[PDB]
Amino acid sequence: SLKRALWALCFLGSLAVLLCVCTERVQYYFHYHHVTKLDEVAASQLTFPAVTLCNLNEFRFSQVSKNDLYHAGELLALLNNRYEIPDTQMADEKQLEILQDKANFRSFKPKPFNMREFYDRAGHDIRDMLLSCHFRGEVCSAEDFKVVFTRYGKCYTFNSGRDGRPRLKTMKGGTGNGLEIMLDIQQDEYLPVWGETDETSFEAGIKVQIHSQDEPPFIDQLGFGVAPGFQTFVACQEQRLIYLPPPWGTCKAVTMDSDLDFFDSYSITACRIDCETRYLVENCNCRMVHMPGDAPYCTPEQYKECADPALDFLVEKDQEYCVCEMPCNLTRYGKELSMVKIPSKASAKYLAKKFNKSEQYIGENILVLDIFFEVLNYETIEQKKAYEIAGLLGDIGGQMGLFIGASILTVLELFDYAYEVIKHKL
Amino acid sequence: SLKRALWALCFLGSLAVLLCVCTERVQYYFHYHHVTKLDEVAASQLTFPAVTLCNLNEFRFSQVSKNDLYHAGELLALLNNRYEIPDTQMADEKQLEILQDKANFRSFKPKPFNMREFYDRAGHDIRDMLLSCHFRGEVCSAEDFKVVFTRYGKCYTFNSGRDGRPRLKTMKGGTGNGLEIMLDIQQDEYLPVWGETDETSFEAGIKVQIHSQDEPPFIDQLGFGVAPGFQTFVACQEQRLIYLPPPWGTCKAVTMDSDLDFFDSYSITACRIDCETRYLVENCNCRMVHMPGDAPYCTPEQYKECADPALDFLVEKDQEYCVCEMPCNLTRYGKELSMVKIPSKASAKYLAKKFNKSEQYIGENILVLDIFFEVLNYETIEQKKAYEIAGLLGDIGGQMGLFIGASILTVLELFDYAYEVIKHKL
Amino acid sequence: SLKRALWALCFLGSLAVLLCVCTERVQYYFHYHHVTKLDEVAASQLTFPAVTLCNLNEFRFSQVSKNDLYHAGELLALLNNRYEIPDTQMADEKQLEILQDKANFRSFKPKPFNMREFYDRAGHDIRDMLLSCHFRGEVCSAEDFKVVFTRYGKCYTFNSGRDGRPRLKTMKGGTGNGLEIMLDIQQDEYLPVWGETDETSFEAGIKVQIHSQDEPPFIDQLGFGVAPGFQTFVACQEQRLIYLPPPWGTCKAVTMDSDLDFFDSYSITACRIDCETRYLVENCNCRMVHMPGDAPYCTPEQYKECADPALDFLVEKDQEYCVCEMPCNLTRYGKELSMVKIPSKASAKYLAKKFNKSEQYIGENILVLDIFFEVLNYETIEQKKAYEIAGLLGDIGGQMGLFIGASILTVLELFDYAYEVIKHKL
Ligand SMILES: CC(C)CCC[C@@H](C)[C@H]1CC[C@H]2[C@@H]3CC=C4C[C@@H](OC(=O)CCC(=O)O)CC[C@]4(C)[C@H]3CC[C@]12C
Ligand SMILES: CC(C)CCC[C@@H](C)[C@H]1CC[C@H]2[C@@H]3CC=C4C[C@@H](OC(=O)CCC(=O)O)CC[C@]4(C)[C@H]3CC[C@]12C
Ligand SMILES: CC(C)CCC[C@@H](C)[C@H]1CC[C@H]2[C@@H]3CC=C4C[C@@H](OC(=O)CCC(=O)O)CC[C@]4(C)[C@H]3CC[C@]12C
Ligand SMILES: *[C@@H]1O[C@H](CO)[C@@H](O)[C@H](O)[C@H]1NC(C)=O
Ligand SMILES: *[C@@H]1O[C@H](CO)[C@@H](O)[C@H](O)[C@H]1NC(C)=O
Ligand SMILES: *[C@@H]1O[C@H](CO)[C@@H](O)[C@H](O)[C@H]1NC(C)=O
Ligand SMILES: *[C@@H]1O[C@H](CO)[C@@H](O)[C@H](O)[C@H]1NC(C)=O
Ligand SMILES: *[C@@H]1O[C@H](CO)[C@@H](O)[C@H](O)[C@H]1NC(C)=O
Ligand SMILES: *[C@@H]1O[C@H](CO)[C@@H](O)[C@H](O)[C@H]1NC(C)=O
Ligand code: NA
């Protein structure tokens, strides 16, 4: 034909192109794509994070008695299974002799034992480890820190925001407008390490973690180190992420009491302590010292057959047992370390006078932490939906309004034209 | 009805859905959303940044006279308010005696005093602090650095691009294709610190800031530290941000002389020095030593009642006095430190010969900075408008072209159909 | 007129606005814009990277013979061009005397020489440099590392995934769930440095690079340093980038044998070694020791006129000779260093016994690397097309369906209406 032969390709080919192009805007929508948004909103009064710091030594050597070596001798790796110093050939010169009159057990008649009570008196004490800190020039106290427990032993927490005291805030950047702690890691009272184990440690420092205040401390997997004899400027940078709920991303939404069995808030580091507690109470009824709840802590004899082999199974065979993902409102904290050597020539003769110690002791034990904010900004890393439902109806309609010019009314008009087909002319 | 009863829901319900969906594409536009764009454009000849480095000690102790302790004795924290060494019990062994015959003032008849003139001769000198630097193997001079002033005292600047000399460029990554400075922090000439103040400092190092060349140095809030006895590889990474003007984001746009009262360009660190100058000249007519302009610097007696308490008020009560935000064309510089111990066994006997100093002095005072580019890239972090006006008319039209099929012509055709209503049939 | 005079502005002005708005959605498409997508997908079993570590000293001083000083004396900077120790006034006390009876050449009759054979026996040996490493507690061997060659001399590689052994994987974060190497940098056997050159080095440490396993080691431009006497916790963070092919970005797509002349895979660091090989074999037929292929390595006499001046020309005059960009599937590795001082008071008397060395030697030569993953995540930084072709036809049609209401059918209906013009009425 002349008029109708051209429309066999025109109206049908444009319809054939439309079904290819209308699908790739509907197949695109069900991917649930999302793009991000980095911003840098300045502020004037930023809150302070929660520093958590503890020594790299769990137990003070000068504060273990003849009772504690009896029950926990396999735990400290100071005795064998037969209760003896395991052939310490050329160990030391004096530190044998403190154990030579404490590892006797000659008809000892041992007292009852506790495990949390062992951590509290034989850990390092912040009344002696700390010398003088500050906060914007205003002085500290030892009562500003709080005793927390984790795998490294007794650890402390500054600005935790727990048990009544509120949270502290900075109003300036700089270096002297944050913490200036002056610790003393006490290398005289370390555990003697003349033996050898796979878990042995040679170092001597302090593990610090800077986290938000809505999390428990998670020192063993998130903390950095700070060397003695150095002043370390830990600059910070507050980041506020905003994630997306499924099917876009993966985020358990925030609520009042979401998935709380032993805590109140919800966090990633608040969840592996939850899943490593319910597994231990249900397997052999233990509870390690850092786990929350009211279940009784178990003996160090149970520590070799319930602590290590059961918590090996959460990373060996039962990695599908519990799973938990990021909350939708995080707050991270970046860090940019840099070190400056602390005991200068001018200060070697004053610090030796003030704390009554040798100049050799000062260069090997004094450690100045220094935490601040770099500039008073905070970055936001959001996740925004790339293709909403209200934008799908636009681009699916603008193609139909281009190729055939038919609206959603006229397709129903053809559907009522088939009603004119069925009985009016048939 | 049969034909018209169905259109009471068809034409009206699709219009009812349209007003919900056309609003959420107009309410979306007035949020002014924006998404970002990270790119990594390789290059071949990148410019070099502007290193700014100075000691952690403001005044050399062996270069203060009996005049300078008279006027600035409260400033250096070496005298009391009654002009005496404040009970330095067991201070030192020799460093008392330099002050025992300089803190006399027995009918001294004091000369006139200046404050910038005190900084220039009693600060640390780069002719003696610097030993030998390099740039791509080609040797330095002491005349490549420039004297600048900030809160830490006299500080120097490499590759500043000021007073005629052009900017230097790198053509390779590596470690030996940048600065290799060998400083000497001079711990023999530090200030004696047998006293105690809140502002006291024990450390001994060097504060470096790597910034762009369109900014003044802002050492006290943006600089890291470098320890003596270590060689620190400061790797860099050039970033070029592009921000957005309001109402999308917050950015004063770039111009020729934007908001310049004492500078020429515009920057964030070039603005707080501006706002801390206009406040000080209008309150008690002072000018601290690091502030630009022609107003006269004031005496250290005015330093206790105008420098510290007035600049306390900009972070206490008048945080709304001046505000200034990011320019739209920044250039940052990342950094990734790492340290290697400098005085090796092979070099302990050569450096002791060449600079005529003991092996104890070399391990406590020699410091090798090493700044380079890691790879010759630069990242761009742009901010792009998510929903322009030209895309609003598409998605607002494709919905109307879908639900009712009415264009902007036919709504005016109905508006002229009401003209046919008003007088042709009424 | 009354009806037709209004349509001179209505139908024509809306058409006039349409050509401005339809262009800025077609001019927008040909920019090929793209936005990014940061995600954080958690995992459970992440692969381990490939550590590459070597000393900062190329040649052991106690293992160069009287033959090697004859041919390579200009290379090591130990002799002059006239084969003599160049006036070493007050050099040392003993280390002259090893060279005083080795730099004789009194009728030496020199043997034939090789250059790769010189690197293999006079480099540092991992059987003596390494003391004890670990991997998740399970012990190492010296046979887990692999000899590779680069510009720093003989370097080693852990977890390379080459020559049959598979790749190792972690299942936990923490600090003791990665490498814990205990190196010994051997400062007794360093080269004597009483001379002076522009390329001279004072430091003594170890350069480590953490890279993926699809790259050759590129130590001299991508490695950080690790100081002796310190234990450095190198935390990691696996990133998986996805780039875009042109015209959006710049990326040679991944294939089986893309641009491989001496390698198998494709990478950025695998390409500059390619371009620095083809240039050297075609200019003066050399091959430096770190270049792959079968071309013969050339003498150190050729090293002064072919190694340095020809490889100066790739960064001076022929920077357009070869160019190669990022592959579309990278894998980077971030790092966050932190140091803890290693030889504690408890371990000073045990390490002195176990490895039979003085306490002075332990604090100056023992170095504990510690590499782990922080948390078992991996970040994805994708680049997504901002404006596809299927979205162009939507927003270009929704504007035409708004302003004039004309589809692509009716513009062809007017084009056939001109066929009714040409001969039916003319
Ligand atoms: C006769 C011709 C003109 C056919 C034109 C029909 C269109 C109007 C259809 C085809 C594809 C349909 C869409 C296909 C898929 C979806 C996903 C669907 O997703 C949901 O959100 C439902 C599930 C939930 O509520 O989570 C919402 C309706 C929508 C947009 C549909 C709306 C109507 C569309 C655009
Ligand atoms: C009779 C029926 C078919 C109603 C259809 C009317 C539409 C054509 C109207 C409804 C919403 C209007 C929009 C509402 C808001 C804006 C924001 C406005 O924003 C500005 O940029 C103005 C201020 C400035 O210049 O900065 C520009 C016009 C526009 C897109 C309007 C264009 C015309 C729209 C799409
Ligand atoms: C009579 C009136 C209504 C004019 C309306 C015509 C439109 C339907 C035209 C004008 C601009 C044209 C576009 C101009 C440019 C391109 C780029 C072109 O880019 C390619 O991808 C081709 C090359 C390749 O395959 O890589 C694809 C067709 C397209 C979208 C065209 C599709 C049809 C458009 C939208
Ligand atoms: C995240 O949202 C919750 C409630 O939705 C709110 O209480 C909390 O303050 C928010 N946190 C941040 C950092 O925005
Ligand atoms: C200072 O230290 C010495 C040695 O430890 C000790 O004998 C002396 O009592 C100490 N003095 C004070 C005041 O603590
Ligand atoms: C930013 O823009 C100004 C002018 O708009 C220009 O002079 C300057 O070079 C730009 N800087 C960058 C880093 O793009
Ligand atoms: C080297 O130092 C000593 C002690 O400081 C000094 O007496 C001697 O003059 C110095 N020699 C030179 C050449 O500077
Ligand atoms: C990148 O893509 C190639 C093939 O396209 C694939 O073999 C490789 O595993 C991918 N790598 C990553 C990190 O996705
Ligand atoms: C220990 O070192 C000394 C001195 O280097 C050496 O004489 C002795 O033979 C060494 N002993 C062993 C067992 O290696
Ligand atoms: Na659209």
Numbering used by the authors:
A (entry chain A), B (entry chain C), C (entry chain B): 40 to 465
Text lifted from the article:
Acid-sensing ion channels (ASICs) are a group of voltage-independent proton-gated cation channels belonging to the degenerin/epithelial sodium channel (DEG/ENaC) superfamily. The ECD resembles a hand-like architecture with the palm, knuckle, finger and thumb domains clenching a ‘ball’ of β strands.
A 3D EM map of apo-form hASIC1aΔC was reconstructed to an overall resolution of 3.56 Å. The pore profile of hASIC1aΔC also shows a closed gate along the threefold axis as a result of primary constrictions at Asp434 and Gly437. The apo-hASIC1aΔC structure at pH 8.0 is observed to have high similarity with the resting-state structure of cASIC1 at pH 8.0. Our structure shows that hASIC1aΔC has all the hallmarks of resting-state cASIC1, including the expanded acidic pocket, the extended GAS belt and a closed gate.
